[PDB]
């Protein structure tokens, strides 16, 4: 039970470490974590080239992320387990995660941008033009 919770600690730590590393800030365990982090870094440093976008290559549609994950991991351990494979396991998950957060960031930006830009045109562009446009805003500020 305790060992099962520590695994959760490892995964969360690896996924977090991978995310910030790619530019999204926000005996003992720490040895294991750093070791796992580094091993993952080496794995990615050696092999990342072969893959483009894992999501794209896997054809991940929303209702098939879990399946695709399980399918990949099951093939990865098809005929057994070694530490190399477990590293690739953590490494693979991290690439998925980073890839997902990236795509979703774009999605969220795309939406809110559309809400705001629609408002700007339907509600604010007339007033902007009545008052000298953006040039007069820039004069007022700076």
């Amino acid at each position: 039970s305790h060992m099962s919770q520590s695994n959760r600690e490892l995964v969360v730590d690896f996924l977090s470490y991978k995310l910030s590393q790619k530019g999204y800030s926000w005996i003992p365990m720490a040895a294991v974590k750093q070791a796992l982090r580094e091993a993952g870094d080496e794995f990615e440093l050696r092999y990342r080239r072969a893959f483009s976008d894992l999501t794209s290559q896997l054809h991940i549609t929303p209702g098939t992320a879990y399946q695709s994950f399980e399918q990949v991991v099951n093939e990865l351990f098809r005929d057994g387990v070694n530490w190399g494979r477990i590293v690739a396991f953590f490494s693979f998950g991290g690439a998925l995660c980073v890839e997902s957060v990236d795509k979703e960031m774009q999605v969220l930006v795309s939406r809110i941008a559309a809400w705001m830009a629609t408002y700007l045109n339907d509600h604010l562009e007339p007033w902007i033009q009545e008052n000298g446009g953006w040039d007069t805003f820039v004069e007022l500020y700076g």
Binding site: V72, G84, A88
Partner: peptide, 22 residues
Amino acid sequence: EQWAREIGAQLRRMADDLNAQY
């Protein structure tokens, strides 16, 4: 078809190199 199998297989070969070197 079976992109997940294909890719998981690629990871497996890559994983096995890393393990051979430790």
